[model samples]
Target: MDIISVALKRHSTKAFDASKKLTPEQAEQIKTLLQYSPSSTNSQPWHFIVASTEEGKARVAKSAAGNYVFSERKMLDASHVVVFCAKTAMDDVWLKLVVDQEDADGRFATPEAKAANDKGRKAWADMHRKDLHDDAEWMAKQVYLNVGNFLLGVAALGLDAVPIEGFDAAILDAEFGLKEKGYTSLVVVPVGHHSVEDFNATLPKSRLPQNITLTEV
Candidate 1:
């Protein structure tokens, strides 16, 4: 199927068939999606943790206790569970790392180009930190860009996924010592095959009409 068909066919899987698992190649593709997902100014202000083993899934599911207990099964039953984390600080150290990586990847033809790229990326980061005073929110938005990329990529891989915002960030953060690492949980996604009982898969996709959703000049 084409990309558009994949988009139309994908749904937030309500149930997963625990027996089904992603092939090693598919898992590698998932990692590629996380690493290559675009961010504003190529800021790359995100981290992702994948849990596939029984113990790993249980550790991730710990965040779903109490009120979020309902969401625990999704993590436990899926082939893989991913915790999407947004960097709490876009500090000099991290920014320098991104610039250095670009340089190492041969992104610059000259010293001036390298400096300019670093300066340009920092300018955008500082804009949110100083002028907007929305550093946290801005970084979280970048992480969601990965979320969008991951969701679509999963569909294209002939897999099902649930992008879960229902889990408790505080619990997950504390559980993973995210604060000490200067990161915070944003979303948890579980990917696998949907169960036979997944009624949502049988439902029609609903969205605003094209005319209402799009504007043409």
Candidate 2:
């Protein structure tokens, strides 16, 4: 699909078609899209939790309770919900795995190339660890990169999606056992075909003019 069309068609859906569901094939395709999303240093410090069943969505909705109540309805209504999470730690261990993956993906052409990458990768990992440490905010930035891609990806699929931030992270962390799984919930996305209740389709997308945000080099 064309970028302009995708950009024009995409909008934050407030309601979803409750009765409609994404096919398993579409779910798998979307999951693969997340797996291939880019990350810094190829750290790949992200984990995706897909909630498709009623019970699964309910568990996810727990994060939307109380102060986050506004996020509850869509969690239950969307055909599928995706929770984007970040690793609890992006230490040397995770760095090693990333470099190994690059080697497997043939990113390293020779022994010298692999050795150089190992050093470079280790250096950056150490730098981030020392500089950023366990700052959840910094890690969430990396996680959001995938979320941005997913917003466009879903639009290109001719599907509806919303980048929801109303849910409670602590509730989700406990419900999804994120802390135990070496991850933490960062963002929630509900994807499906929009229902008639979603008036976002009738409203034109609004954004700051390009002239205001763009600067000529």
Candidate 3:
């Protein structure tokens, strides 16, 4: 499929064909796509836990709040669930570079060099200003980029998927033993075939045209 069409068809599928299952090859392909996703300074902090078992799915659904509608639906219908996690320590080197610069005493030699240095310093300060808990938030943003790639990949592969943010991150982290490993849960996605009964299956695409935000310089 053309990349444009793949993107156009990539919708968050909420109703899946419960009986259909993703082949092992299909599941592995998704993971492979995530592995190759671009990251800041190549700091690939994302990790994934595939939940193909009923018990796992149920645990996730429960963690998402007992009444989480989409999660419950996904737990009952989708072939598999993938919990995305992010590791803050993976970017410690990048963080340290920022810290080291802030602690530096020397001034830049030239005016132009000083201007550039100031810009770099501001960027570093902004990153450092974030509280400790914000590490997970930063990591989550990186994981979402990979999720975007995965969703489009799913469409290209003729499979259906739903990227869900409506879940309990804390509960999921505990249930999946992520806390012990120093990982924070970010998002949940259910992958499978779409069902004929999915009412939103034929919904028309919705978006604003490029003219709204784009301008030729």
Top-scoring candidate (TM-score):
1
Q: Mind giving the per-residue lDDT tens digits that candidate 3 earns over 1-53? A: 69988887677776889899989999888878777887553446678988888
Candidate 1 global CA lDDT score: 0.93
- Ranking of candidates on TM-score, top first: 1, 2, 3
Candidate 1, residues 1-217: lDDT per residue as tens digits? 7999998899998889999999999989999999999999888999888998999999899999888987899999999999999999789888899999999999999999999999998898899998898999999999999999999998999989999999989989998899999999999999999999788999999999979989999
TM-score per prediction, in order, is: 0.97, 0.94, 0.77
Candidate 1, after superposition: displacement of residue 6 in Å? Answer: 0.4
List per-prediction Cα lDDT, in the order shown: 0.93, 0.86, 0.74
Can you tell me which runs of candidate 2 are displaced by over 4 Å?
Answer: 132-136
Compute the lDDT for candidate 3.
Answer: 0.74
TM-score of model number 1: 0.97
Write candidate 2's Cα lDDT for 1-217 as tens digits.
Answer: 7899888878999999999899888898899889989877667788999999999999999999888887798999999999999987766677778788889989878989988988887776666677757545556778999999999988888888888989899989999788987899989999998899888878977889989999999
Ranking 2 against 3 by lDDT, winner: 2
Winner on lDDT between 1 and 2 is 1
The deviation in Å at residue 154 for candidate 2 is: 1.0
